[PDB]
Design a binder for this molecule. Structure first.
Ligand SMILES: CCCCCCCCCCCC(=O)O
Ligand SMILES: CCCCCCCCCCCC(=O)O
Ligand SMILES: [Ca+2]
Lengths: 250, 237, 25, 39, 269, 269, 237, 60, 25, 25, 25, 25
């Protein structure tokens, strides 16, 4: 009922977890000589890239309704990875997602941690609007579920969490790679994700293969002094691969 | 010319036929297929997953998460009902759950069901619930006595949050209608076995979640259009 | 070429891969 | 050349059955199934 | 393709609890009837055959009705339709497939021409249907050289000829059709499946030359998915579809109406 | 029919340069990806099947639409069409074949009759289509004895009968159909493919005897090339075709318009 | 009469069908075939040839040879761009080149490309160019630095006029659209590595040509009508 | 296309025909059959039973 | 597959159990 | 006589060389 | 099953005795 | 019964001598 995850020059622990779960049940790997189409020697930065990258802790309260980040992107600023990301047209990788969040025996609350593939959200509006690149590309900060007017609601994604953001019901969300953090039981979740997408590699920028999503299904209640706890996120990419070596795009 | 003979039915289009047909793109060679995580072969695969039950569907919680949770009181000191739901997979509120929704594409079904419950209250919070499925042929049990004479399961929350329990397929017939008339598959009442108990300094309410999936047992048939979703007036291109 | 489902014949009268009937399992 | 439908936009030729009597297309050859109809 | 059978079960009094698990794991808890109840012993016939992928999407449905309105006068100028090809247009279908994040399959397209007569007579009508790939020259008149279809695939249909239909080999340039797409343009634009699933376009045009009888052509298009695979199942669509290639769903001055039926009180369904 | 695969390549530092060649030779320089870049190793599926000659011209296209106008009155006198046979009439097609200097192949001719009704009724219409070889007596009336077709090949079509179609064995008196011809007449005249590719002519005539309803027949002709070979590929046609059997192309008081799109500056596309 | 059954599709004409059909000329015996130099079997054969690229398509050179050549200056002493073009085979100006034109008959394509360059200036004239293909996903490189970080090839003109260089098929997907939308295959910029240098008494400009052909790699699919050519209004017999 | 030939009778519906016909419910698996007392195979089975004769059928 | 009643061929051109002709005895 | 492309039967019902279907490669 | 009259095939596609073609002698 | 002209099958579906197709040489 324990756990020690090591990647690159980084190691995680958790004195109490639900046994992490593997994406669709496929441990990540490099690209098949048989599948590849990138006809050039891919670069694999290895320990430098395939390491743990800790995010920007977001704050959960009795009022928080949800957050998400998209992968890749998120780690667009994180060392070589980020760098290698833009410098190459194409890239491929799977990641280890470790979501941690401690509390105490004297709190209650539950979070759905779920990784989504090709997660196409829906702008919150009636008729020909779309979503604005900039908005599905938050970086490490991610999107919060803020219900209070945006500067250009014409390209805003729906702020409707319980609709999984895409006209699917939360609760039929489990159909994705997911765990639950239930304060009273565990204190962190973990997921390992292979490359998933209908081609060998894809543009690191133009597209996010993934999309993590967290939601307080069960409100953070407490009689304790601290009634706001932080949720940290740490991600290690695995089998980092880039082709199409050129200049660094901006 | 080979003496042949035309058959009643001929020249008719049937949305569910199975014939060969010339190709429009001869000599085409489709993109070679590739290694693509987590495929799928047969729907059942789905129905065999835990979807969350929208248990609390009062006009009150209807468009929030809170419809998925049920709240328990440290103040309740008695054999009190907590909630109940019809069994038919495409019964409300199940219907909208993965399995329910899938079922909603077939006319027939049979199998046992796997309902799972997760307590969420503080670690120091204890309780003992009673999960009871009551065979059709009778009506919703009113008392706890009335409930527990049927198939049930006393749940002790202690360390392991969850506790799965089963709805044994128990039908007169083999299969059953995905869309039920007035016919039922019984219901699943929820009772206080003990009393949700806390220490001093603790939330006095407790979230409780509920899921459903089909058993090794479960099975659907008779492919048909879904009702849990519609289109009135066209979609924009 | 004939088989057993849930005996009948079925070769493919068509030269292209797609032309062919519904798959087996 | 007539019978209440048929009638060429010309003195001679064959004959153009109503319809392309001012239909933005050139039938009876003298241009005359189209000659001066703006109403 | 069979379902397991049910085995006699007996009065367990084990130190081992299988019923008690934790969903946190992210796993569906493994418990079967016998585990929890002194059960019978049942030989199961029940068949999942029908519950097969191909058995699902392997059914023909409508994806598009392309109505063409005959205009005697400027005949050789209009009287042709176009349709940007896709399935995202006809809920029924759409939803199913929208069940999974990727799908691969060949397509059997079936046609249904309907002549709504307008003059007291129909006469003789002949339609053409050119599948026009992206890049191919688009027809711009009932008489565009394009309908010479020297390399394109065109299929002809006349009044009295039986429903036309053909087969089409999985297209796309990647292993599968994208059902959804969390990505944009090379120009950071168009967040949508729309980026990829340009397949080209379908075009019809009546061949029958300038004539007498005003009339209407209502060719409906039908599609069966063949030789099917799919991955990464997603939750089903919950409400109406607004537009194609977009997940959008918020509607002009109207409620967010799911499918869930509401009730009075949970302690009674 | 497969494409070679791509092989891992490595950091060459050779005294041997493969990339450096000379086009003067008249040769296409032999250099492959690996030669110039540390490449991956790729198993290629990709298929050239479709890229096969027969796969190209092996598709049915239109070559001619022969419109016949029914004239009640002098019925047995007109009401018959003629067409000097050839492909040089319908760009789409023409261009492809005009891809090579010679071609050999059998032909599958497919027909599409269209009755544009004129009186409030169609009645019963019956067409005849006599292929008339060069030398054979040409019909000169809807009732020419010639339509006895005692040796000629004629095919009949009526309202309701399904599209007619037949097959034709590569004709000509030389190994291949000439696509082009840098030669003249025995009388130094007619510089043109026209010298040879007289194939005879196609003729139609409605059989249905003197009746009531004025109407129009629009038989379209379609052609698939079978069992195909070709030699000496030529550059494609660059502009519109003017006339048949001639390469001519300069048009009455209009620009020489290619297909090339122009740009502002080469240092930006 | 053999009990038979008519099939949805029947009686329909399909321009891409493949059925047998009676012969109109029975007992005909076609001219025996003969020895006929340089046949052809599969189009690709073509695409595998060097066609000249209309690189210089300004309204200026548009209907002359001069659109096929590019001129270099002995006076330019810097990292200066010389020209660039989109990669998509049916991209402009490639489109009109043999391969481009052929591709323009199919909807799909994949492979690497073989671009070749021929210097033409006096024998005593030297230079060093830089030929660079820049992977899509970004936009036309503005500086030489920006260019050369991608796949490239420093060309030294010395004795062998030409220098072939390759555009590695480098796609996210297997095949690509012959007709591209806003999607690109990157571009091929051309730079001054050194400076076109001459002696005293020598032309100070230099013609430079460009060709394209498909690699062992290249391949097309999805047969479709060409766009690079039209017919409006009939042809005379 | 296999040179075939259409037969007098064709296209006709006959209430007593015997042809095959596509299924509307592919991949369907009917309820397994069961032990069900006193079946029947051929009518005669019936006629071989004693029914009572309405011998006295006066209006009375 | 052909037989004797009250000789003829009959395989099932159809993939589904119900599709098939009238039973034997 | 039946084969494998990119199994199906195909003899020629026709007596003339041209009558026959599309060639192989 | 095929024969010689005044060679051709002929099985009975029909299950009933009467269904069958014209007799032999 | 199938052959080679200027491979295809051809039995006679017909019982009468005249019914049959065009002769050989
Ligand atoms: C000419 C017939 C057109 C039929 C096209 C079927 C192709 C399905 C592609 C699915 C793309 C989509 O809708 O997302
Ligand atoms: C009666 C049907 C006529 C079809 C003729 C096809 C013969 C093609 C000959 C090519 C000659 C040419 O166009 O140059
Ligand atoms: Ca007119």
């Amino acid at each position: 009922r324990i756990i020690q995850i090591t990647r690159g020059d980084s190691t995680i622990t958790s004195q109490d977890v639900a046994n992490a779960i593997v994406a669709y049940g496929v441990w990540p790997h490099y690209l098949s000589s048989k599948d590849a189409s990138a006809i050039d020697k891919p670069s694999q930065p290895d320990t430098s890239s395939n390491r743990f990258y800790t995010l920007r802790s977001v704050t959960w309260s009795s009022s928080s309704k949800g957050w998400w980040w998209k992968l890749p992107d998120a780690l667009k600023d994180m060392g070589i990875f980020g760098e290698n990301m833009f410098y190459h047209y194409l890239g491929r990788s799977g990641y280890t997602i470790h979501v941690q969040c401690n509390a105490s025996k004297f709190h209650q609350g539950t979070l759905i941690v779920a990784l989504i593939p090709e997660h196409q959200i829906a702008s919150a509006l009636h008729g020909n609007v779309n979503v604005g690149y900039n908005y599905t590309h938050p970086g490490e900060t991610g999107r919060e579920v803020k219900a209070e007017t945006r500067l250009n609601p014409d390209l805003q994604p729906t702020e409707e969490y319980w609709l999984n953001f895409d006209g699917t019901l939360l609760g039929n969300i489990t159909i994705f790679p997911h765990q639950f953090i239930n304060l009273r039981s565990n204190n962190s979740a973990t997921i390992i994700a292979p490359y998933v997408n209908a081609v060998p590699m894809d543009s690191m920028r133009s597209h996010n293969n993934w999309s993590l999503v967290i939601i307080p299904i069960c409100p953070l209640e407490t009689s304790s002094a601290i009634n706001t706890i932080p949720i940290t996120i740490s991600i290690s990419p695995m089998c980092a691969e880039f082709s199409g070596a050129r200049a660094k795009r901006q | 010319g080979l003496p042949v003979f035309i058959t009643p039915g001929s020249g008719q289009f049937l949305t569910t036929d199975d014939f060969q047909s010339p190709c429009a793109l001869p000599w085409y060679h489709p993109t070679k297929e590739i290694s693509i995580p987590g495929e799928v072969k047969n729907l059942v695969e789905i129905c065999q997953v835990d979807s969350l039950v929208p248990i609390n569907n009062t006009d009150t919680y209807i468009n929030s998460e809170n419809m998925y949770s049920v709240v328990l009181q440290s103040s309740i000191n008695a054999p009190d009902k907590i909630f109940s739901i019809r069994t038919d997979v495409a019964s409300q509120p199940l219907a909208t759950t993965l399995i329910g929704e899938i079922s909603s594409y077939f006319t027939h079904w049979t199998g046992s069901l796997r309902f799972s419950f997760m307590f969420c209250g503080t670690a120091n919070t204890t309780v003992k619930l009673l999960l009871a499925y009551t065979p059709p042929g009778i009506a919703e049990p009113t008392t706890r006595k009335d409930a527990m004479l049927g198939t049930h399961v006393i749940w002790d929350v202690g360390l392991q949050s969850t506790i799965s329990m089963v709805v044994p397929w128990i039908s007169a017939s083999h299969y059953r209608n995905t869309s039920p008339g007035r016919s039922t598959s019984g219901y699943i009442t929820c009772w206080y076995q003990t009393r949700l108990v806390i220490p001093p300094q603790t939330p006095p309410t407790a979230r409780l979640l509920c899921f459903v999936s089909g058993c090794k047992d479960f099975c659907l048939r008779m492919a048909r259009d879904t009702n849990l979703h519609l289109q009135s007036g066209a979609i924009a291109q | 070429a004939q088989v057993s489902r849930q005996n009948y014949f079925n070769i493919n009268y068509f030269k292209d891969a797609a032309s062919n009937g519904a798959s087996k399992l | 050349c007539r019978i209440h439908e048929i009638s060429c936009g010309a003195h001679s030729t064959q004959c153009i059955p109503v319809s392309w009597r001012c239909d933005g297309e050139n039938d009876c050859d003298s241009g005359e199934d189209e000659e001066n109809c703006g109403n | 393709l069979v379902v397991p059978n049910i085995n006699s079960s007996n009065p367990t009094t084990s130190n081992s609890a299988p019923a008690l698990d934790a969903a946190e794991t992210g796993h569906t808890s493994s418990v079967q009837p016998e585990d929890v109840i002194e059960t019978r012993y049942v030989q199961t016939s029940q068949t999942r055959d029908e519950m097969s992928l191909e058995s699902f999407l392997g059914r023909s449905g409508c994806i598009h009705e392309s109505k063409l309105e005959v205009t005697l006068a400027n005949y050789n100028k209009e009287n042709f339709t176009v349709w940007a090809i896709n399935l995202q247009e006809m809920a029924q279908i759409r939803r199913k497939f929208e069940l999974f994040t990727y799908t691969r399959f060949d397509s059997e397209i079936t046609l249904v021409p309907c002549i709504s007569a307008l003059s007291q007579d129909i006469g003789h009508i002949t339609m053409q249907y050119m599948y026009v790939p992206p890049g191919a020259p688009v027809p711009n008149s009932r008489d565009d050289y394009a309908w010479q279809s020297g390399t394109n695939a065109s299929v002809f249909w006349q009044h009295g000829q039986a429903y036309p239909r053909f087969s089409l080999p999985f297209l796309s340039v990647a292993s599968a059709y994208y059902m959804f797409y969390d990505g944009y343009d090379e120009q950071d634009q168009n967040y949508g499946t729309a980026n990829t699933n340009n397949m080209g376009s379908l075009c019809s045009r009546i061949v029958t030359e300038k004539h007498i009888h005003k009339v209407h052509i209502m060719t409906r298009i039908y599609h069966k998915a063949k030789h099917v695979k799919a991955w990464c199942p997603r939750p089903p669509r919950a409400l109406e579809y607004t537009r194609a290639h977009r997940t959008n769903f918020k509607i002009e001055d109207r409620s967010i109406q799911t499918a869930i039926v509401t009730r009075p009180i949970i302690t009674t369904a």
